[PDB]
């Protein structure tokens, strides 16, 4: 069925794993260690020299968002129509932008840039709160009334920021409620509480 | 029909403009001067505080790749099936990653970083030459045998790099031929030679 090749961390694979668990899909995890990665042969076979690598039958994919979109399309988590699909993409692109900023902080200048990043955070989260408010008063999902691949990506992004800055969602009632509601989904709640998820570090340098 | 709100530059709108021109679609251009932008009303109303803003009927969209994907979906430029669509996304994500590096250089450290960037460039282009070689020997498009939104994005990325580093494609026979072939498409060729395209600067700071 599905195969996820990645380092022993949550990182860019956390959202796709949540998506697979919540949809009741089965998959295999191929763990790649820092030592194996420095060996160089695997890396040189990765299209863009980076993990994760994903397999669906004999379809080999790279790029976390490409994988999320693929699963969204094949599992019916890409909106009810073309209009919603476009909005789902818009949300995911926004999520991706902040994730890049987050990743940069963690691996580039964590000690001297965390305060500045946390201060600017509220401004970075407001867009999602607004999107929520424009869709049924934020009582359902980010787009429409069915879950999309973007919801898992957004959920992950929010969860890791709560770790980086506890209480960062206190000012956002819709995002806070949204996190609680999706975290309660039966299959997702089970997964989020399992060793598989919990005992994996968020990032590879031990910072969070 | 379509409306594109953007600064008087090619930047992130060049690819979608080429796509609209090549597909024979009409669209209006709403030019936003830096003056008008440094004012505030407009920017504050953009979902993520950035342009371009795009309208299809009453559907308002932000994020260049969201727009490309929307047009790809509604105009049939997203692959023949689900497998091709996935590959198309993979190509576009790669294009986006390099564009981010390019944008960074132009706007962050053009003077002291151009040599280093040009030296690493070959390694950044090889992946596309590789995908091209695996599809009918690079005799058609990047994915399958029909053009996709990714092709226009890739085309733009290659064209701007030729400006940044003349001859950078000399080492890539498939990419070079690919650029010539797509540049020769009737509607696209006409568009690429028009004042509307030619008299607009590539970036906003006058560097390229």
């Amino acid at each position: 069925p599905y195969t996820v090749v990645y380092f022993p961390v949550r990182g860019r694979c956390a959202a796709l794993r949540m998506l697979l668990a919540d949809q009741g899909q089965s998959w295999k995890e191929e763990v790649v260690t820092v030592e194996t990665w420095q060996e160089g042969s695997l890396k040189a076979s990765c299209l863009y020299g980076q993990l994760p690598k994903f397999q669906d039958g004999d379809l080999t994919l790279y790029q976390s968002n490409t994988i999320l979109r693929h699963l969204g399309r094949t599992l019916g988590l890409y909106g009810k129509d073309q209009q919603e699909a476009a909005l789902v993409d818009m949300v995911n692109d926004g999520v991706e932008d902040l994730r890049c900023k987050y990743i940069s902080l963690i691996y580039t200048n964590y000690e001297a840039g965390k305060d500045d990043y946390v201060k600017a955070l509220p401004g970075q989260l407001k867009p999602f709160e607004t999107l929520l408010s424009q869709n049924q008063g934020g009582k359902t999902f980010i787009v429409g009334d069915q879950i999309a691949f973007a919801d898992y990506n957004l959920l992950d992004l929010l969860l890791i920021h709560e770790v980086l800055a506890p209480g960062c969602l206190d000012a956002f009632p819709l995002l806070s409620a949204y996190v609680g509601r999706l975290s309660a989904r039966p299959k997702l709640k089970a997964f989020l509480a399992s060793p598989e998820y919990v005992n994996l570090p968020i990032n590879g340098n031990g910072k969070q």
Side-chain angles (χ1 to χ4, degrees), chain A:
Chain A
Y2 305 122
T3 299
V4 178
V5 184
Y6 196 58
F7 304 113
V9 321
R10 297 181 194 173
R12 283 184 173 284
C13 280
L16 62 83
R17 285 165 174 152
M18 294 183 263
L19 187 160
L20 289 177
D22 195 52
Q23 293 301 142
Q25 297 302 299
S26 280
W27 79 94
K28 167 74 185 314
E29 294 272 357
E30 297 263 73
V31 181
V32 186
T33 64
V34 167
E35 203 186 317
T36 312
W37 187 246
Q38 298 182 310
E39 183 284 314
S41 60
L42 198 226
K43 182 189 191 314
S45 61
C46 292
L47 184 60
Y48 302 116
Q50 299 185 303
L51 295 182
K53 173 179 170 181
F54 182 86
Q55 297 195 304
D56 184 347
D58 64 38
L59 212 200
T60 291
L61 266 27
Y62 297 94
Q63 297 271 19
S64 58
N65 293 127
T66 286
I67 302 166
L68 286 175
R69 289 195 163 81
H70 177 59
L71 268 24
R73 204 143 41 216
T74 57
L75 263 32
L77 312 172
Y78 218 132
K80 80 193 205 314
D81 56 34
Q82 283 179 157
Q83 182 156 293
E84 298 205 321
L87 298 181
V88 167
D89 281 327
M90 183 166 79
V91 171
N92 198 265
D93 281 350
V95 176
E96 179 50 37
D97 284 336
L98 180 51
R99 188 181 288 289
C100 284
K101 295 188 178 185
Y102 169 82
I103 290 171
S104 175
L105 174 76
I106 294 296
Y107 296 105
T108 274
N109 52 177
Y110 182 82
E111 290 68 49
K114 180 181 173 62
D115 300 317
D116 259 41
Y117 182 101
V118 170
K119 295 174 180 175
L121 227 195
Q124 304 302 98
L125 296 169
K126 198 156 294 194
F128 305 115
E129 176 79 359
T130 304
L131 287 169
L132 232 35
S133 74
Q134 299 175 332
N135 179 202
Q136 289 155 289
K139 300 276 294 172
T140 68
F141 302 100
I142 195 63
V143 177
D145 48 51
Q146 55 181 109
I147 201 164
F149 68 88
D151 288 283
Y152 298 105
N153 200 186
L154 176 60
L155 178 62
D156 177 60
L157 185 69
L158 299 175
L159 287 172
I160 66 179
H161 275 77
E162 269 273 27
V163 169
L164 177 72
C168 65
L169 274 42
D170 290 333
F172 300 100
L174 274 24
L175 291 177
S176 298
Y178 171 81
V179 167
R181 189 188 318 133
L182 271 55
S183 281
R185 295 171 63 81
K187 296 188 190 303
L188 227 191
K189 179 177 177 172
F191 181 70
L192 290 175
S194 67
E196 194 172 334
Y197 179 77
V198 171
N199 296 332
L200 240 60
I202 296 174
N203 308 113
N205 65 354
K207 301 188 187 181
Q208 59 182 42

